[PDB]
Amino acid sequence: ISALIKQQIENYESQIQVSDVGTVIQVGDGIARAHGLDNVMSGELVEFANGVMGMALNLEENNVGIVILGPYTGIKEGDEVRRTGRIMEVPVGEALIGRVVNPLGQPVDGLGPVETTETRPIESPAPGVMDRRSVHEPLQTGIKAIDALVPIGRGQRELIIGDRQTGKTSVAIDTIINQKDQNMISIYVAIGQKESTVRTVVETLRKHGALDYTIVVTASASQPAPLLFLAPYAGVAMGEYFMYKGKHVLVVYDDLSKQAAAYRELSLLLRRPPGREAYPGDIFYLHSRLLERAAKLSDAKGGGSLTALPFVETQAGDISAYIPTNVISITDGQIFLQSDLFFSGVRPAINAGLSVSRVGGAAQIKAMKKVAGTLRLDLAAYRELEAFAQFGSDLDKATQAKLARGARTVEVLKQDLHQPIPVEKQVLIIYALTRGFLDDIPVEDVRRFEKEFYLFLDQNGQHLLEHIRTTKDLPNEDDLNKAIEAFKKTFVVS
Amino acid sequence: ALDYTIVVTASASQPAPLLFLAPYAGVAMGEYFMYKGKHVLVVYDDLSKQAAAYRELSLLLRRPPGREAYP
Amino acid sequence: SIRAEEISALIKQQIENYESQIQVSDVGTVIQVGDGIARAHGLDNVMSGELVEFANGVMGMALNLEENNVG
Amino acid sequence: MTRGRVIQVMGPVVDVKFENGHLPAIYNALKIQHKARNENEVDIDLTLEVALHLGDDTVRTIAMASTDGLIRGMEVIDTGAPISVPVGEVTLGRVFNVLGEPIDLEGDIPADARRDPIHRPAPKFEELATEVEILETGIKVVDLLAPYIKGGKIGLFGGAGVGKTVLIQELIHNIAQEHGGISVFAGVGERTREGNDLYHEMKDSGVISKTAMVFGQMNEPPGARMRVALTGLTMAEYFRDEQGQDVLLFIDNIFRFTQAGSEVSALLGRMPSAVGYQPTLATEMGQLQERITSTAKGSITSIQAIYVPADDYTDPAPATTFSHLDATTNLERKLAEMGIYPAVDPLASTSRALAPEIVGEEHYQVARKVQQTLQRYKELQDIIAILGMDELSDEDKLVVHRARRIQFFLSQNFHVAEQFTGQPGSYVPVKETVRGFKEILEGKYDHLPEDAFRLVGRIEEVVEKAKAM
Amino acid sequence: MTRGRVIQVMGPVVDVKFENGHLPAIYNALKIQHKARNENEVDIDLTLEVALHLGDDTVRTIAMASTDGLIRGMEVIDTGAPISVPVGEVTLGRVFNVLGEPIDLEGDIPADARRDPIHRPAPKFEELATEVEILETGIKVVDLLAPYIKGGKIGLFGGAGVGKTVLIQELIHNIAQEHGGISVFAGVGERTREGNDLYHEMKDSGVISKTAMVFGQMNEPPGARMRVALTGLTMAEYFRDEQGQDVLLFIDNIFRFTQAGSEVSALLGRMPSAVGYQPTLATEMGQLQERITSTAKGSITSIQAIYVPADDYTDPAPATTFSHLDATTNLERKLAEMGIYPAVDPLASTSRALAPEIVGEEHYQVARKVQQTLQRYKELQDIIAILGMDELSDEDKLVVHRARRIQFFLSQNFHVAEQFTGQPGSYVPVKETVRGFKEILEGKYDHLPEDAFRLVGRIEEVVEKAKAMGV
Amino acid sequence: IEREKEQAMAALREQVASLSVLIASKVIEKELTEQDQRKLIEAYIKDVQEV
Amino acid sequence: NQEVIAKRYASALFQIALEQGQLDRIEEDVRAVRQALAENGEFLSLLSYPKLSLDQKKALIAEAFAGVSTPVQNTLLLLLERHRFGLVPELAEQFLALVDDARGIAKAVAYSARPLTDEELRALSDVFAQKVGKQTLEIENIIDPELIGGVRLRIGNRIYDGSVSGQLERIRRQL
Numbered sequence A: 001i002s003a004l005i006k007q008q009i010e011n012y013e014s015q016i017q018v019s020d021v022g023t024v025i026q027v028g029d030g031i032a033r034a035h036g037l038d039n040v041m042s043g044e045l046v047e048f049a050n051g052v053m054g055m056a057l058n059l060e061e062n063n064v065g066i067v068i069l070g071p072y073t074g075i076k077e078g079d080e081v082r083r084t085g086r087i088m089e090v091p092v093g094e095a096l097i098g099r100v101v102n103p104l105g106q107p108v109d110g111l112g113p114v115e116t117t118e119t120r121p122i123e124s125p126a127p128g129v130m131d132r133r134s135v136h137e138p139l140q141t142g143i144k145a146i147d148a149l150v151p152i153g154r155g156q157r158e159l160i161i162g163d164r165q166t167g168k169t170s171v172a173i174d175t176i177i178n179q180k181d182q183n184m185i186s187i188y189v190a191i192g193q194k195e196s197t198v199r200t201v202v203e204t205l206r207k208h209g210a211l212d213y214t215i216v217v218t219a220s221a222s223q224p225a226p227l228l229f230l231a232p233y234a235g236v237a238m239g240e241y242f243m244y245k246g247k248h249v250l251v252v253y254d255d256l257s258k259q260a261a262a263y264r265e266l267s268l269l270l271r272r273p274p275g276r277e278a279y280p281g282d283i284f285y286l287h288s289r290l291l292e293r294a295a296k297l298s299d300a301k302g303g304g305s306l307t308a309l310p311f312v313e314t315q316a317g318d319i320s321a322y323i324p325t326n327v328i329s330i331t332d333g334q335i336f337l338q339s340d341l342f343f344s345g346v347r348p349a350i351n352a353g354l355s356v357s358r359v360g361g362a363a364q365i366k367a368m369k370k371v372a373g374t375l376r377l378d379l380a381a382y383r384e385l386e387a388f389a390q391f392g393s394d395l396d397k398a399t400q401a402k403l404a405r406g407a408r409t410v411e412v413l414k415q416d417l418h419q420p421i422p423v424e425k426q427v428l429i430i431y432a433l434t435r436g437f438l439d440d441i442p443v444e445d446v447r448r449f450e451k452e453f454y455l456f457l458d459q460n461g462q463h464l465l466e467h468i469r470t471t472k473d474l475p476n477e478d479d480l481n482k483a484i485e486a487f488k489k490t491f492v493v494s
Numbered sequence B: 001a002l003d004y005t006i007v008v009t010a011s012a013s014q015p016a017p018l019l020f021l022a023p024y025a026g027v028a029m030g031e032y033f034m035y036k037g038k039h040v041l042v043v044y045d046d047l048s049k050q051a052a053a054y055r056e057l058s059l060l061l062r063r064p065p066g067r068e069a070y071p
Numbered sequence C: 001s002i003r004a005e006e007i008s009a010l011i012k013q014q015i016e017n018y019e020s021q022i023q024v025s026d027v028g029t030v031i032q033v034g035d036g037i038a039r040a041h042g043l044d045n046v047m048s049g050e051l052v053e054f055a056n057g058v059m060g061m062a063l064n065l066e067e068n069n070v071g
Numbered sequence D: 001m002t003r004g005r006v007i008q009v010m011g012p013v014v015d016v017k018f019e020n021g022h023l024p025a026i027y028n029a030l031k032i033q034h035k036a037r038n039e040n041e042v043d044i045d046l047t048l049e050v051a052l053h054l055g056d057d058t059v060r061t062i063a064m065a066s067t068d069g070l071i072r073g074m075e076v077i078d079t080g081a082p083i084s085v086p087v088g089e090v091t092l093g094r095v096f097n098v099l100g101e102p103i104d105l106e107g108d109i110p111a112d113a114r115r116d117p118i119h120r121p122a123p124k125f126e127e128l129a130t131e132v133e134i135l136e137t138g139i140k141v142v143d144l145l146a147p148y149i150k151g152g153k154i155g156l157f158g159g160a161g162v163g164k165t166v167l168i169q170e171l172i173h174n175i176a177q178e179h180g181g182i183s184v185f186a187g188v189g190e191r192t193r194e195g196n197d198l199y200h201e202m203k204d205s206g207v208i209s210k211t212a213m214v215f216g217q218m219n220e221p222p223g224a225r226m227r228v229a230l231t232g233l234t235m236a237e238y239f240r241d242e243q244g245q246d247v248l249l250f251i252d253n254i255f256r257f258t259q260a261g262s263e264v265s266a267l268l269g270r271m272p273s274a275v276g277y278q279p280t281l282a283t284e285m286g287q288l289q290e291r292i293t294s295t296a297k298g299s300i301t302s303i304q305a306i307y308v309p310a311d312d313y314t315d316p317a318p319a320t321t322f323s324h325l326d327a328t329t330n331l332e333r334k335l336a337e338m339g340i341y342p343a344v345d346p347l348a349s350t351s352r353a354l355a356p357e358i359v360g361e362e363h364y365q366v367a368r369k370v371q372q373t374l375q376r377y378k379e380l381q382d383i384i385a386i387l388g389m390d391e392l393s394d395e396d397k398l399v400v401h402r403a404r405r406i407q408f409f410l411s412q413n414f415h416v417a418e419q420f421t422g423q424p425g426s427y428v429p430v431k432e433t434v435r436g437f438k439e440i441l442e443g444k445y446d447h448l449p450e451d452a453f454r455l456v457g458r459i460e461e462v463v464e465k466a467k468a469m
Numbered sequence E: 001m002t003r004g005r006v007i008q009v010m011g012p013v014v015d016v017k018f019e020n021g022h023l024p025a026i027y028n029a030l031k032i033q034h035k036a037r038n039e040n041e042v043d044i045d046l047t048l049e050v051a052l053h054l055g056d057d058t059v060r061t062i063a064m065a066s067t068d069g070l071i072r073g074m075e076v077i078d079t080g081a082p083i084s085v086p087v088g089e090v091t092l093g094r095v096f097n098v099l100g101e102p103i104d105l106e107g108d109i110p111a112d113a114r115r116d117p118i119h120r121p122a123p124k125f126e127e128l129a130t131e132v133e134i135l136e137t138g139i140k141v142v143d144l145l146a147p148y149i150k151g152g153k154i155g156l157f158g159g160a161g162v163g164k165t166v167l168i169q170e171l172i173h174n175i176a177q178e179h180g181g182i183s184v185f186a187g188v189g190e191r192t193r194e195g196n197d198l199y200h201e202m203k204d205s206g207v208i209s210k211t212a213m214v215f216g217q218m219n220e221p222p223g224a225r226m227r228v229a230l231t232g233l234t235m236a237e238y239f240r241d242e243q244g245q246d247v248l249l250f251i252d253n254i255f256r257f258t259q260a261g262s263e264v265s266a267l268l269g270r271m272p273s274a275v276g277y278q279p280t281l282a283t284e285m286g287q288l289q290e291r292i293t294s295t296a297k298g299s300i301t302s303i304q305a306i307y308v309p310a311d312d313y314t315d316p317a318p319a320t321t322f323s324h325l326d327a328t329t330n331l332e333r334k335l336a337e338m339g340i341y342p343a344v345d346p347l348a349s350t351s352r353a354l355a356p357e358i359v360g361e362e363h364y365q366v367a368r369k370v371q372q373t374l375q376r377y378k379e380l381q382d383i384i385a386i387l388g389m390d391e392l393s394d395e396d397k398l399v400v401h402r403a404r405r406i407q408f409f410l411s412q413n414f415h416v417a418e419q420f421t422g423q424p425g426s427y428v429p430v431k432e433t434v435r436g437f438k439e440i441l442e443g444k445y446d447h448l449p450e451d452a453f454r455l456v457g458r459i460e461e462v463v464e465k466a467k468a469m470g471v
Numbered sequence F: 001i002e003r004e005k006e007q008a009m010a011a012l013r014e015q016v017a018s019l020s021v022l023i024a025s026k027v028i029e030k031e032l033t034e035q036d037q038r039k040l041i042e043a044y045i046k047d048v049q050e051v
Numbered sequence G: 001n002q003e004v005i006a007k008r009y010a011s012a013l014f015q016i017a018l019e020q021g022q023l024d025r026i027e028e029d030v031r032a033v034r035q036a037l038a039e040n041g042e043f044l045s046l047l048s049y050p051k052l053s054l055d056q057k058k059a060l061i062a063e064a065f066a067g068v069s070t071p072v073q074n075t076l077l078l079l080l081e082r083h084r085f086g087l088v089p090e091l092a093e094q095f096l097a098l099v100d101d102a103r104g105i106a107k108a109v110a111y112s113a114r115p116l117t118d119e120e121l122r123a124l125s126d127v128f129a130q131k132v133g134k135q136t137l138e139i140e141n142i143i144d145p146e147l148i149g150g151v152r153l154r155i156g157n158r159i160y161d162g163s164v165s166g167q168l169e170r171i172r173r174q175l
């Protein structure tokens, strides 16, 4: 206490600081105008008298349009706005891993300061056409229906779209928890969520040890619209520090529709003329300069990637709305979550018809392809025959080989919560499903069959797991049929 | 029935402020008997005309419009 | 709300020629150019809906005649 | 000096000009006490909430009462704070307006009382509660099928003769009996005679001594109706923070909050957002419903009525409230006419907390078996209608014979209904209702008549009611 | 010696003030090159184009890159010309940004190369060529019902994620090798990874070195995306004017041109137009689209994907561009959710070349009878939806029974869609798709099941797929 | 607990710093400024030279 | 929105004063007009009164604003005809800013705990004239005795602080 004070009093030297100030004209609804600031540049961080930061959007001929980044109730007409000299810096670094911060990079969890060295600008250009490379590496989510049906590769943008209370955040937390073995650095950007739910999300990440590699960037529902507008841009600005070092980064945006609503707010308060659904004209460009800044770099740039998982909340499952179709035409696929399947018990409620992956298929691990093509056709046949053939009898093939296998596909593709599966066990259980080995186990016991089969594989079939873990191909099919038919004698049908 | 009825009228040809101030004159005539202990029935024939007239007054006074240009 | 005719080249020649007002009856100078629209200071004796030629030879139709400019 | 001049008056919007540097901050309160100096003037007591800074030392305010009589040049007090509202034990059993002044004729609150500001930032990330724990109400349909959360937002769907006020009143009685907390009723934008009826119901039911009422009603300007939930919530926050207890916070018709915000935005001259709503709809709703949270000190759990205009659950004013809700308790007319009190529709009522990781495995399995049994009974209603009660099957007759016992065991005797029915009413803890519904599902009480299950608390009480009949 | 200062910076839109009598013309290019004197400044290399005149010697410009870092008072250099783009044989095999600069890392184009200005007036009346002849595509819906024109404008209307980039890649795969002339690809506001994939399949398939590529992807600020298609177009019209070459032109999402205009229009000082669009939504697109023409010197057959916002065909930017196109294929989400790929609406898709004098008589009768059965089935949709197939009067049952088969034999497997499904994909000539649809209309294949017609090239493959199904 | 301890230490330090600054200001107020005014002018000149 | 229009009108009057070669007289009587309208603020409210006709208000300006030069009086009458008489002090301030930009005189405000001597003011002018690029410079001095032992000088919108915030800087650095 008294030693460092004397050392810093013996180490200081005198200086005169410049200020470069301006005075406030107007304050209202989170947006200010200000005289002065003659040499301020566009997009520069400015600082008010009380310590609140601001963002200069509009440089007009005598005033500067400042967007207040924080609580605007302490800012009055006549206050003093000074410059910082910097264009929208957030602190970036390795030291930010394990922390919960606001979109300006200031710590919110209360575990001390975040001691970083370098900063990156919030609005930086995307990688070029020749700076990219095709997505060929798997991003394993641990969800069986994702990793089988709609696979995600490192470097793409997979929209996860669905109604409220459909399990989007659960899918996000499962695929963040699964990256513990990989060299993936996750980022969870929470935009407009309840801060109690973000609190429980941080706690269920630290229970599974996930805060050793992930960063939570929160901008809650009570925060003003400028902090809601700059949460995803802070997410990519914290991810690109590791992306351009060669690392691989996952970035999840919880409810980008709550970013679009807040940018609609921030632009209608700037009195900009709105379009369809009262959104501004650059509501596409908002998401497009965000998600296109998430790439798979080439070997000259470093090889690192930035895989993004944005969310869009629909109203009554309408995928043909304005913000959903704006984000579908940016991303490389979608995972569409039903509410009918979610309330009928199918969790994760992935609608396998409306969900698609574009660079996926070139992302699967050379075993999941062979194992999961038949799974996808069986599930499509089941969910297009169940709605029509509910009443009345039919022929024996459509009564058995479609429906009695498709109910087993549905019972396989269900998961419990916060339990991601390694991909070799997924490959083996969908092999046992599609090769006709669950046709005698009844529908009500397929999940117990799977839970016991994983414990069987961890003891006896370890060579199969290590073969898929190293070779990535399936093992010898007779050698695997021996293990599955040997487990079936042990299993009790009940 | 005109031994106990008061009639307040504001026609379509009357200016929009009289259309706006007809029902407030109605309750101003009614509250005098209400706070003496009597019982009053007040009948507002087409308050939608009052809504249209106050829309007219607020738009000619160039107050900012809302839904269906009502203030 | 700045007016269109408040240009420091136009204000100069109106303060200089304030005592003896000269008339811009047939000539005119351009204030704004954009998207097929021209505001023109001057042109005191134009008719509404008149053929009007520029210095290039391009024709124009004088629709709006405001107080100190021509649309 | 902070003495200002009135510049513009136009409806509920007042523009006031101060000196330079002495401008009031946004959301501060501005009092106007003007006694008439001659016969050409009107006495005025009127307060104003600062909403903008317009420049030229001018401030655009919103008004909390009628602006008739205001003169351009009438002088305005700057209070230096937002609307400071009295907090503490002096508010329990009192009715208040949005300014924190008693509507009741019991007496005035003195000047030395503690007054907390109406506009507070929400509690931080470091102050919230990490675990989701269940607020136990003792109402079996609530804490068995749509369980509440300490810090939760709950949607009452119903009204007009389905037992909403009785449910509200029994919630106050049970929470203030067992959990030791208090309640706060914030009547936002709802009519005066229903506030009078609710006042006299809580007056003659004894519930009112443990609650505080805040009425901001229809006859008030939109700036007065918008700040009602905030001035009831800042009364709930005293007992969350200083006392550290679990508080209820009732907001009757939360849709009136959103539309009063839309009206204040239309008066302020803002460009309208999607449909007819303010641009700041999600931000105003977040600044309301992120202070209704559970901290380490206590909690505030809010039961809220939602209007859902045009029968449209995708309208932005329902759609932004539903992003904060955690449970819905659908009140049905059909269950009220059947003789089931409370009239909570068991199948329509859902909850985020009804999950095995939150409540437990036993409660979850019993609740899902109850829901499946009632759903199959609702499906067999048409078969019983077109075919008769008998000759369906053995399993269908058994599931009807258990489901009707279930749907009559859901009703309770309330402590609030003791003044009408004479029976004392019961608080049923959640382990006993899980045990009771498990024993009804396992067939332990098939031999008892089904009219003993109606309007009784526990399962031992239906044993004694069946042996008494 | 006459330079200007920056007055206002409002997003993509910069105000520059010059001296009296030295302001530029509309559409001229203005360069900002700043040196970052102290720590509080940023190096800037911006190009601005003039858009308006405001009076008091001020100029309303649109920036071509990001304006982050611009200080008021910064000095602006006038160039005296619009954005000049290098053109010639030096653009074949190269990839360009919006300023005409190469971005393929293979070098830099020399300063003595020929540079045409972007902004020129459209070709006149007397210069155009109005010959109509079929461009054969190998796609059954396109060959049967909306035949494309060798030298005319072609539009691919669709929603979001419905198949128009897959369809533009299938048309590149079916036409661009067979074409024997210069191709130009303008990427306006599509994905940047779709510019990487497409460049590498041009490299793999050898269509590069007879291809000039220009990308203005959705990361770019809207001043770029308003001028990308004009750069690709001045590259194409050099070839068809100065060389008389046949030119393929491909634009993915020319909707992004008008959307980028809408993003700037509010800041330019304009009142809102229909919906959120500029008032100039028709003339800004007409001054672009009417330069993409076939004249007496050469032809440009331009195939353009056109995004449709919120699946609303009545929106002004999809509605005002139907009048520009010769042949269209309207893609439907309702057909894409049925597994019908290409999801071309067979009724709403039209052409100027479905006439008996062009495709022949038999082609025309088969096409019109296909459209008649599909229209009768669309009329019977409500009776089928409520009352089912049971009450139809025994010719309407035959209409439905044939129209399911016709609707599924419009779907086809693509070469490009091999990465989606594993199925290798087909190329159906026009005579064989007319023969196949004629044999479906004659009743020859009523006995086969309807799932045997999905994703199948010719009608013998329908026969062998039904044989493998077990009929 | 460790975090709480660190926070407490930081709080105490902040309080001490605040106390010290006010006292320093009072001492400066007490101290004669005639000598100081000349020095400040020199310092300003030096600062100008530096910048 | 008034300062840009005042800059517009003042730039027009500045170009007139340079083309007539009479910049000093226009500066002097613009200072006189600014002092006369800052002395009494009821004159603008008198000229905003509707029952006075435009010719009567022009007669009030021609009788009252006499002795000023001819372009200044023509500028005031042109503002009266355009209903822009409310921005005459803004016109005067923008015009004197343009005149001081032409002459090279800069405006600076120095806050010092002691009243500065004239040699120190000349030294500060000689220091900051090379810093802002101007030829000469002016200092206005206000004591403000909350400052302790230093100078806090402001040129336009840039503050050169060396008085108190060294101690505030070091207590912000220790904490």
Ligand SMILES: Nc1ncnc2c1ncn2[C@@H]1O[C@H](COP(=O)(O)OP(=O)(O)OP(=O)(O)O)[C@@H](O)[C@H]1O
Pocket (backbone or CB within 6 Å): A163, A164, A165, A166, A167, A168, A169, A170, A171, A347, A348, A415, A416, A417, D323, D352, D355
């Ligand atoms: N795979 C699963 N298995 C079991 N339960 C699940 C699963 N996924 C989600 N849930 C349950 O669904 C509930 C809500 O899901 P979640 O909150 O992820 O949806 P959401 O769309 O993010 O909701 P909101 O949009 O309101 O935040 C959770 O409480 C969780 O218990």
Ligand SMILES: Nc1ncnc2c1ncn2[C@@H]1O[C@H](COP(=O)(O)OP(=O)(O)O)[C@@H](O)[C@H]1O
Pocket (backbone or CB within 6 Å): A329, A356, A357, A358, E158, E159, E160, E161, E162, E163, E164, E165, E166, E167, E341, E342, E412, E413, E414, E417, E420
């Ligand atoms: N011919 C086809 N066969 C199979 N699937 C297709 C076909 N065309 C499109 N699709 C599916 O529809 C999606 C449309 O993608 P794309 O055309 O790239 O986007 P957009 O239509 O928005 O430009 C693809 O991801 C693909 O999965």
Ligand SMILES: [Mg+2]
Pocket (backbone or CB within 6 Å): A168, A169, A254
């Ligand atoms: Mg969520």
Ligand SMILES: [Mg+2]
Pocket (backbone or CB within 6 Å): E164, E165, E190, E252
């Ligand atoms: Mg596309």
